[PDB]
Amino acid sequence: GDLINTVRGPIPVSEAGFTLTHEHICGSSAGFLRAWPEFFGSRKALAEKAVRGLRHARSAGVQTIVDVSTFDIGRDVRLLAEVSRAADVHIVAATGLWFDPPLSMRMRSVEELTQFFLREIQHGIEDTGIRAGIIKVATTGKATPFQELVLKAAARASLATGVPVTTHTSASQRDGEQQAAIFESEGLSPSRVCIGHSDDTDDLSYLTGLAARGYLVGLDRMPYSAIGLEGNASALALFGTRSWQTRALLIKALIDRGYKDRILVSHDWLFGFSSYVTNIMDVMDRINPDGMAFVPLRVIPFLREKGVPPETLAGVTVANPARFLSPT
Ligand SMILES: [Co+2]
Ligand SMILES: [Co+2]
Ligand SMILES: [F-]
């Protein structure tokens, strides 16, 4: 009877089922959806699009997503609850800080940040009573001084609550190694940590080094590719030039090296996106019309056809998220 908190309340761990561990309803900024909803057409249009997309994922077998939007990604837990209910897909919300914190966060101490993360896990987000079930943190290269405090505060909040920590990295810069060192300096167990965007690199020395230490490896950008769009500089910079099959081969590469229990798979998809160039959501929807159904529709069959046993795929998509999310 282990439980996880969702935007609709507590659920049994065993009901999470097929879980995408790094997703977003909307990638935005604090206050932005409230102040400028017309950027997304309207709030109603954004919610309707998210409901359609989540229903499509559900039809393809997805039962839960972890929306890793923090305060500074503009997380709107009321929107999450509305779309979760309408689409019948569980959504786990996040606390933490990504790489766009405002001054009122950047000026805070490790102790103050710990209190904020604990508020969102133990009390509730804003005035809603909805509790976060994961802590999201970020570096983009070597940690800034402030990011070091964020990572330490995340470790402290995790140790106090059992909730896991998940990260954004610049994978080509091997950020996960420094992240791990900071977390371990606070006594955090690697089994509570997912080093994300790890499919942005093919450096298996880096990835197996983390997996060997007990970290979860987040292969979470499966549909990201600018192949065919190389003349679009903004798409090229965000999506890269590696195909989805190349990204998916990393799942098999880690399985083949003994690390099936250390893999989490996701898309890093969204239904609105205001923190990048205007039009980016349209580019993305053309790349991947299947949205959050892409992993079950394309990635899982690709792996099965390469010989990965169904039981292993179920372990990656069901058992690993359940172990990760269960407070421990
Ligand atoms: Co990220
Ligand atoms: Co993300
Ligand atoms: F992301």
Other C-beta atoms closer than 10 Å to the C-beta of 286 total: 10
DSSP codes of every residue in 232-280? -HHHHHHH-S--HHHHHHHHHHHHHTT-GGGEEE-----SEE-SS-TTH
Distance CA 38, CA 274 (A): 11
In angstroms, the Cα distances linking 113 to 21, 26, 188 are 23, 24, 17
Which of 134, 217, 224 lies closest to 177 in space, CA to CA?
A: 217
Other C-beta atoms closer than 10 Å to the C-beta of 98 total: 24
User: Which ligand sits closest to the CA of 69?
Assistant: 2
Distance 22 CA to ligand 2 centre (A): 6
Distance CA 206, CA 22 (A): 20
The distance in angstroms from the start CA to the end CA of the chain is 13
Is the Cα dihedral 272, 276, 282, 288 positive or negative? negative
Q: What SS3 class is residue 295? A: helix
Distance CA 314, CA 18 (A): 8
Distance CA 56, CA 39 (A): 24
Residue 268 marked ligand-binding:
yes
Q: How many helices (H) and strands (E) does the chain have?
A: 15, 13
Phi and psi at 142, nearest 5°, equal: -55, 135
Q: What is the 3-state secondary structure (H, E, C) of 180-194?
A: HHHHHHCCCCHHHEE
Residue 297: burial class (beta carbons within 10 Å; 0-12, 13-18, 19+): middle
Indicate the Cα dihedral angle 4, 223, 214, 312, nearest 10°.
80
Which of 186, 190, 181 lies closest to 213 in space, CA to CA?
A: 190
**Where do the DSSP E strands lie in the chain?**
3-6, 9-12, 19-23, 26-27, 64-67, 90-92, 94-96, 134-138, 165-168, 193-195, 216-219, 263-265, 272-273
Distance 168 CA to ligand 1 centre (A): 4
Q: What SS3 class is residue 290? A: coil
The Cα angle at residue 243 between residues 242 and 248, in degrees rounded to 5: 105
The first and second tokens of residue 186, run together, are 């606070």
Question: Which residues lie below 8 Å from residue 321, measured CB to CB, with a gap of 6+?
Answer: 16, 19, 21, 64, 66, 264
In 3-state terms the chain splits into helix, strand, coil percentages (rounded to 5) of 50, 15, 35
Residue 267 marked ligand-binding:
no
Distance 217 CA to ligand 1 centre (A): 14
In angstroms, the Cα distances linking 56 to 21, 67, 82, 97, 211 are 17, 17, 16, 29, 32
Residues 88, 50 contacting (CB under 8 angstroms): no
Distance CA 166, CA 97 (A): 11
Other C-beta atoms closer than 10 Å to the C-beta of 185 total: 12
DSSP codes of every residue in 114-134? HHHHHIIIII-STTS-PPPSE
Distance CA 181, CA 80 (A): 33
The first and second tokens of residue 314, run together, are 């179920």
Phi and psi at 319, nearest 5°, equal: -65, -45
According to the entry, how was the structure determined? X-ray
Distance CA 273, CA 280 (A): 7
Distance 124 CA to ligand 2 centre (A): 22
**Domains within the chain, CATH numbers bracketed:** 1-328 (3.20.20.140)
The first and second tokens of residue 190, run together, are 């690697």
In angstroms, the Cα distances linking 17 to 13, 27, 187, 208, 305 are 8, 25, 30, 26, 23
Question: Which residues lie below 8 Å from residue 307, measured CB to CB, with a gap of 6+?
Answer: none
Q: What SS3 class is residue 144? A: coil
**Where do the DSSP E strands lie in 143-201?**
165-168, 193-195
The first and second tokens of residue 225, run together, are 């590719």
Distance 217 CA to ligand 3 centre (A): 14
Residues 128, 158 contacting (CB under 8 angstroms): no
Residue 24 marked ligand-binding:
yes
Distance CA 160, CA 157 (A): 5
Residues 280, 34 contacting (CB under 8 angstroms): no
Residues 21, 66 contacting (CB under 8 angstroms): yes
Residues 98, 32 contacting (CB under 8 angstroms): no
Residues 274, 28 contacting (CB under 8 angstroms): yes
Distance 212 CA to ligand 3 centre (A): 24
